[PDB]
Structures are given as C-alpha cells and as structure tokens.
C-alpha cells in the first residue's frame, strides 16, 4: 500500500477474533423437540398405584 501520497508501506495481513459460544448443554442432547400448529399447548398426567390386599 502507498503511504501519504508518494511513499509505500508493508502490509502484514489481517487479525480477527470472535467471542465464546458455549454448547456444552446443547451437545448432551438432553432436550427433545415437538412441532405443532397452535400457540397454546396442553399436557396430560396419569397417576396410578396399588392396594394392600388383606386376608378373608
């Protein structure tokens, strides 16, 4: 490259940096994905157990 209007300079290439991007949690694949249609979602839960049978 030129310097001022009559001299020259040496060019030493570019230097670039970027910040961190952490993907440890994402990499573990813990989460699942579901794709739907509406903006309101429902979930259902069912609880079941057992009984203590006596003698007769």
């Amino acid at each position: 490259m030129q310097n001022g209007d009559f001299q020259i300079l040496d060019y030493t290439g570019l230097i670039s940096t970027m910040p961190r991007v952490d993907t440890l949690l994402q990499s573990m694949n813990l989460f699942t994905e579901h794709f739907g249609r509406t903006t309101v979602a429902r979930i259902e839960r069912l609880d079941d157990g057992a009984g203590d049978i006596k003698a007769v």
């Binding site: 310097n3 001022g4 209007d5 009559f6 001299q7």
Partner: protein, 148 residues
C-alpha cells in the same frame, strides 16, 4: 469546488549537494540534537512546522538570527513529501533530529531562517566557519512554456 491536489517538487540531494566522505566514520559530518517536533500548544493532529533546510542552533532551537546558526536540518522525518507523522507525537515532545555540520556543499537558496526568510551574508559567514561551501552556482531548470 476547486480540487484536491498535492505537489512534490524537491529532493534531499538538492540541499546537500555533496559531502567529504570520511574513512574512519561516515557520521563525521552529522550531529544529533533534540528538537520540539510539534509546537507545545498546537493540537495533536497539527502537522509539524519544521521544514527541511531550516537553520537550527546546537540546542535544537531554529535560528531567527544569523548568530544562532549551527547546522542545517536534514532529518529524514521532515524531507519533502513525508507527511505521515501526524498525531504520532505528543504536543511538546522533544525528539532527536540529525543536523549536518561539517564538510558539505550547501545550496544557497534552500537555506532559510526559522520563518522562511532567506539568509544574509552574516549567516553565510557564520555557517562557513564550520567548514561548508555555500554556493550560488546552480543551473536550475525550465518547464513547458520556456522555449529552448
């Protein structure tokens, strides 16, 4: 809108027309002094007021009188065309400069006092004492419109 234009019409060889080359040390002709490159009060981006060929005393102060003539500033930082050093020096900074003192052939016309005014006979006598040959024998040049 006029136009953005720059011009360069001078060289280093047109100030020191020739030397006496020493065998023991090539620096025998030069002395180094400390000079106020950018005026104390001028802003950081102001260009330096020094111009090659000015007559400066041994203490780094440009001479406004014939007595304080000690050498001709021929530093490579103030030669024609070298404008890069803008804002590179703190206002009021003192930076070393190279002066040419002994054993030279010096052009009469390019020597100038601190304020551009040419040098008188007293200046010529004062500078010659260091052992320099101030001469007027320059052919010059003619351009374009001067028939030959």
């Amino acid at each position: 809108a006029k136009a953005h234009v720059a011009t360069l019409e001078g060289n280093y060889s047109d100030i020191v027309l020739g030397r006496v080359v020493a065998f023991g040390d090539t620096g025998w002709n030069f002395k180094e002094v400390d000079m106020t490159f950018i005026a104390d009060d001028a802003d950081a981006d102001s260009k330096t007021t020094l111009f090659a060929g000015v007559l400066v005393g041994e203490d780094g102060t440009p001479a406004t009188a014939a007595a304080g003539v000690f050498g001709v500033l021929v530093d490579r930082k103030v030669l024609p065309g070298v404008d890069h050093y803008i804002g590179v020096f703190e206002p009021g900074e003192k930076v070393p400069m190279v002066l040419a003192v002994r054993g030279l052939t010096l052009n009469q016309l390019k020597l100038k006092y601190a304020d551009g005014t040419a040098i008188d006979a007293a200046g010529i006598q004062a500078l010659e004492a260091q052992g320099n040959q101030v001469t007027d024998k320059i052919v010059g040049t003619q351009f374009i419109g001067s028939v030959l």
